[PDB]
Amino acid sequence: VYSYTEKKRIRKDFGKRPQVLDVPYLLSIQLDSFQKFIEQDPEGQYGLEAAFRSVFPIQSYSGNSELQYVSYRLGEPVFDVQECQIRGVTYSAPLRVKLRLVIYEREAPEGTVKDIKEQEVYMGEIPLMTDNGTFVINGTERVIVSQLHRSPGVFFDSDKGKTHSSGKVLYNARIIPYRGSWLDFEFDPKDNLFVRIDRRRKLPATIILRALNYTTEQILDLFFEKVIFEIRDNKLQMELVPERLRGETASFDIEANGKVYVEKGRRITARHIRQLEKDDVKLIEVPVEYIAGKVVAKDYIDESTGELICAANMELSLDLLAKLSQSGHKRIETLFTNDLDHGPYISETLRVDPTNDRLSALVEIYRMMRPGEPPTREAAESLFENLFFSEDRYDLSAVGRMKFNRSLLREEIEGSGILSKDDIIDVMKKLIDIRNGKGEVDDIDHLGNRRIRSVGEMAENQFRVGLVRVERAVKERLSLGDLDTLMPQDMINAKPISAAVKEFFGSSQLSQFMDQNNPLSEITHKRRISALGPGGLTRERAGFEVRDVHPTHYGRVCPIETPEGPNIGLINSLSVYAQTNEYGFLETPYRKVTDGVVTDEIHYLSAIEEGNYVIAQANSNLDEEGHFVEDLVTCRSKGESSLFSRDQVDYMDVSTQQVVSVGASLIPFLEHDDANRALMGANMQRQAVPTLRADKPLVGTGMERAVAVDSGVTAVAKRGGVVQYVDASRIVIKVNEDEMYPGEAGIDIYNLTKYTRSNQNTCINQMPCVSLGEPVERGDVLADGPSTDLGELALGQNMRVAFMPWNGYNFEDSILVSERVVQEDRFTTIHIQELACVSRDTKLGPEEITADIPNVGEAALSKLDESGIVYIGAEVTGGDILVGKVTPKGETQLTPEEKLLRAIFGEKASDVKDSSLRVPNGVSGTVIDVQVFTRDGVEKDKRALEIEEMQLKQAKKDLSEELQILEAGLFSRIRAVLVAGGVEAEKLDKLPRDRWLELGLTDEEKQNQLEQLAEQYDELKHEFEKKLEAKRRKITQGDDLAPGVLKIVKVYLAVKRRIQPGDKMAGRHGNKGVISKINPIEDMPYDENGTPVDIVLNPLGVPSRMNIGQILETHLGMAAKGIGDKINAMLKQQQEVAKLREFIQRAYDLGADVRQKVDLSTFSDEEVMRLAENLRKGMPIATPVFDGAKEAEIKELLKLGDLPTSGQIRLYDGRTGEQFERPVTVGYMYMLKLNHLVDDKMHARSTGSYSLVTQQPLGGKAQFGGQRFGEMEVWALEAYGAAYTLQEMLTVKSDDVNGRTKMYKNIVDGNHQMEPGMPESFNVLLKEIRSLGINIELED
Amino acid sequence: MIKGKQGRFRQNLLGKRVDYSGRSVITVGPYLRLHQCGLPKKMALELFKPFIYGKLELRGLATTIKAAKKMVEREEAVVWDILDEVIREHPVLLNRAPTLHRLGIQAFEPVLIEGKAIQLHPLVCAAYNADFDGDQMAVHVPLTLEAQLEARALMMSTNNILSPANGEPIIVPSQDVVLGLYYMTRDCVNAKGEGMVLTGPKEAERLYRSGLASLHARVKVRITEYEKDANGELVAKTSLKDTTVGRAILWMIVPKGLPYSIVNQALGKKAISKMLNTCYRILGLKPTVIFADQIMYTGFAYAARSGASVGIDDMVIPEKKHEIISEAEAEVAEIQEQFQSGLVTAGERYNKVIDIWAAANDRVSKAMMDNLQTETVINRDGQEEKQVSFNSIYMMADSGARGSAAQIRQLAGMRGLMAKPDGSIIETPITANFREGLNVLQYFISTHGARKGLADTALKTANSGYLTRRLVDVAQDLVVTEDDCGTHEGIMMTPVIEGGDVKEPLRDRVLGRVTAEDVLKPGTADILVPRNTLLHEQWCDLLEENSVDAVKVRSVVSCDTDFGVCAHCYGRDLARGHIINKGEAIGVIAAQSIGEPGTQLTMSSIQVKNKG
DNA sequence: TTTTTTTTTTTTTTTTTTTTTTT
DNA sequence: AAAAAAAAAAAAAAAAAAAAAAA
């Protein structure tokens, strides 16, 4: 079924795969995170509750005074969003925390607290997030792009050592914690394990273990197993382990069990090992010389006198063997030595171990962290414990613990956030195992190890920083705390937390000014996954293993969409269906597959879980039961792809477009497109300016609807019903009766947004797209936003194009454009600038904004007002004064006679220099609004009072009219109730609306309801009065500004650019182009029946830079407009429904295999006529990205119109009137107008304003700057013989004031001549050197 | 004061915001000559402002200077006339953003357009490398009269047909002009106007314009060629020669000296550059500029009148594609089954799989290239016969307009086996051209190679930048300061043999460079050319006819000079042709030539094959 | 067999917000 | 205590020790 707004225009859809999981609510990653941050969590596992209970409780050292946290609440914001945009403050709200402080007596720790107190104390102010996932922080929407970073946990990374010219692999383990100090280990080239806590001076890896209080024997036992030995006659017998003999050769004749198992020189083959095990061959005689190569396991001490014969980790010499034999040491147990499988690299580390004392290792760490400090036992122990063990300075967060436990194959999923002995021990174990050929390594660019940090986590992090700081302050005060003489306001301080959090949401690299020049730009810039930011990979330190695309991005990150240039592949986007797992790893949905039945139930899989199973690609067909029609269905596996059997499939994709992002799934026919050009097309679409009148794209993808609805700027309804009263600035919706509240419904008052500036100078204008009285269903589109059209997103506009190389003007990639496209003015934006003029108070009196200005003609003052501010609607131009501002004539100059004058005061009527802010050169405009802002204690002047009264009167009108409309709804409800009971018509309509309860009504609930409504009416009166007073107060009170400013007046210029011969239009498949000429309507080439063509692109951009998608788009657009022309012809003849209904039904069928299956039979022919009216200039066609529309369908669709099947038509040449041979393509490629506008690019310069200290011409487009003559151009001139031009680019046009003036004189005087002579810079340098005692003389 | 960025030693090197500057987006400029740069009005009344003041106050239209200022700011009609007068001949310097080459600061004359976009002649879009998709060029001006003469003599866009590094021209028809030329001259077996003898070229153009004879029409005409057979004399010979009507039409643009056969083929991007270069060598410079203008114009016009447009139906797919792919699939199936049995190890199985995929890819590529090319069977007024096709994709590829055989293969044939992100070649290739659709798996695979290419280019940008900087740092010292060092120790150049694959003959690597010892013919006691002689093209031809396998050439690697390098010992400048005149710096010529072409740089028994 | 000289490989030293100073 | 001004946001030098060579 189709709602009213949907029924306005059904988009023909070519899709085939039945959707099972519709597109989710975009921006979910943002709203879910932030609601997680602020929402009162009773369990308090995440959010502000978690941070508070982490930092709390508090108490000074032996203070007998404990500060505890009770609860937290987020009060209402002081302002609301719209006035926040107007004013400039953050859209923040207070954060009131209920705290409790209790203090005991002396020698009563456990005794009852002597005194208590509790208060809802103010605890900082926190920014909030609007309904679009944006933050209004300084009169502008800042979006906190979520970041991507290496997850906390342990990552045994090989770290392939391409250095050393040896190929050796320096296996590296890195226990990265979420909060604390790192801890990594690596094998050095000498096969010795080393540690460098926090990347400071490397230390032997053993050190921490012997700093962990582990004895050398304990260290050896933990790292190494042992081999038992026994002195038994000559050639002491040792426990034979045939398993240990694996990967070893018989260094001696193995003749045990009366059998020659292995003669000397032969390996111990599997045959011999099996024979040994079968006979249970065990401890046997072995040579002592063979044992000589072993290493002593324990610390053998001569028992006769208790003298250390030898500590462990020493090789066995026969003298030592005899010595221990005489002492009675029957046991000669040695560490099991090997290299193939049990390489004891840590034994070599122990050999390199400089010391063994625990305190010695503590001192080693103490010097390691803080070099050169005085060694100390207590401080060293505290350092060693607090680096890892102490919770406060180290915390593997729950994500970190989970990853760490899973990496070490622990049975457990949850544990403490601090490490332990066994943790590092097992890390070392697996590290040596990997180096010993037991275990592969992880790759950090596998999304299982990458993690997605949203806004909420970042806010919690910064707020926890603030909490620990204020807690430190609290402890400071408590240690000096007085006895119950101050409640928790002196101990507390809101300033640090507020400063920290506003520093984050404001000045941070992840709070970018929202990209608002299109709805798609907004939504893409929200759903963004950046690899930069704190604790991340800086855009130059990152290499290439991360700028690449890993084979798990599929379903979690769009390969196509990413900015190019400096940082390519660091700023990946998010798939359309992607989510964030509870830990924060990018999951994705898959269709559960039980046997052949692909069950429509959906399961969300993380990154690692994907590999464990085998998945089918989305466009694998089915047979109405979920069974794969092709039994050996293509499927993907642990980074692989093969034809798996019909039963060897555990999951299937949800839809044909979960690999891409919305920023690139809007592309149609994306399948028939190279990845490079699709990437550039997605980047282009993201920055398309919203033209004057939105135009529904003629070839969409079915994703434009959802993108526009969920982006935020479409004024989506809230409750269904009827549209009581449309308007250009407001829509009022009478609610449907069922959806009405228990009382006082019938009111929506959707305040549309008339013209206002965007964050890139593009009008954000919302227009109403509902006819009066039309019913509306919930969640529909009442008012089109900027670049929206009945809900559908409309970025650019259609334009009938003809791929043919015209006379050159489309040479490289240029684009003709017939005058018609600019004549009918379909590309024309409404850029709205914001010039801000301020009035500071510097030395020598304040700045004056008076209209009185010296040295200005009457023309400038003609349009100003008396105060000095231009009137609204003043068609200003270049150079006109917007604001009349002046300064008090410099400073203290001349001589002490000037000080005498100042004592007497000067004698100047003017006594003020001109500093008025004019229109920037080269821009027209019609002033819309001029806001005035006043520092408190500054009396509002004439213009300020004018605006103040205007806004106050308008606000009075607004409150009055909303109250009136709500009262009208209330009385309509009263009348509806009075239809039954008290229905006296004459008595009802005789008396006025003063009393509609005195009418007769028996004992019924109706009169009780009327009494409730009357209470609502009186409450409405009182609430209206209070809102009115509050609004008056807010308007009247002066707004605090930056220091030293009396008042600032900001004026919003509005301009109407036009498509012109330097812009940069671009299709959607990356096919850029700069408009090269605006031809007359005639010179364009016109098809057979007269209609010209509005663009002539260059064909030779197709075959190379292969993006043949756009040709398919052109053809399908041609067919779309063909059906449109057919419907237009039928309507112009005023055909009778049957013709229309039949034709539209046929066009919508076109369904060899499709999913539309629409029917216009039950369509209320009036609505069929409305549909024809909305389709009479095109039949919109959808084409999901990879379940596209095949060519044969396009041929049939064109054939439905009378147009030729080829997609090509003969075009006549307008200028001559002959025929182009070689018939040419003509279709409707939906072209954009990217906001690289020529008149924001061009910037001339002859002798404009110069610089401050460099004294060169001032650089920058914002200040009339000339192109920079960098070094490489200096080389370019040197290569040529041209020298004078270089010598003049360096001296007579950079800094030489005398040379500049002389050259200007010569030019105006008519002489073309530089002045030969060394530039004065040489003279300055010469005197500089002569300052030093250096001759630095000249020569010949 | 003598240290750091503000140190007054390294101060004129950091960068200076030069006055009289400019900027704009760029726009194509056909109808311009090859030495004209369409400059906007709104930017040419703020560049030549002081010049306007001078010519205005001098003319007396407004004697006082402030009146002149207020007149120009008043847009009075006279100021347009005065500005036209001052910019009558006042060369401007158009500079692209990264100025690797020494052509990247070429200078043009101005012609004023309306609007705001620095037009730019199409042919000179190559040296700049601009692409008219948002590229922005800066306009400087030379003030002092010496600087004007430099901008007109040393840098004018019409005195740099030959780039510094490689001798051959860098004003070479590029994208649409070559497609137009290609279309304008192609042999069609039978078409309107077939089988007739018209006249010289004039009646050929008359026939085409009237529509009587189609553009492609194998027909005999009477072109007369003025060949320089005699010593510096235009010897004229005329005769009934076969050609095409379009070929006769194009012949009118060729200047006198060239022989007719220079344009009788189907002019691609190769033969057209060869024609332009031959015109250079035979009739000097200025005729080459006139001929480049004419070729660009008569290429654009007939490209338009052709209307070569890329309909989708012209990317023909082989009907044998699916059969070949099924055969390859069966092959990999048998190989995999055999590997499962253990008869072949995993590595051998994988190598065999990729090899048979490569073989199938070759088969499909040959099939599609055969369907695109030829394949046009048409009656010749008798029976049928086949001719090279006119499909717009194939027409482009054969012409070399933009897109060689590889890319059209990717458009119609299998698009290959995309290597995994590491670099190892994927076992299962992409078996779907672009005309048919890709699949989520296949497209997601292609993104790997695409993004790796993009990132590697982005890095190689700065790599080539650093390399150029080092080179110009160690080369800027030199300057050709000695006419002749009078040495004898020049290296002996020979054709370079790449292990049995001699590529560069003695032609190039001794072209122009001055011989040290007198070239001796292989015949004994037969001095071919004297000692200190310039090896221009005719002497090179003499070397070819004598086929000298080794000649001693003076080399700058060892010239007896104190602080420079001999003029003779350097050779030709390889930007103008004649021996390098005293002064022109070669170090910052060299460094940049060995620089700029850096980003293009990618980041048992012998069988005798010849008679000898 | 012992001492001295030379090499080499390892280590350590080199436009906006905040902080410190002044009134 | 408030307001205004200044500055922060891997290469190589030296030296210990190991190894060569001469007395």
Ligand SMILES: [Mg+2]
């Ligand atoms: Mg470009």
Ligand SMILES: [Zn+2]
């Ligand atoms: Zn020389």
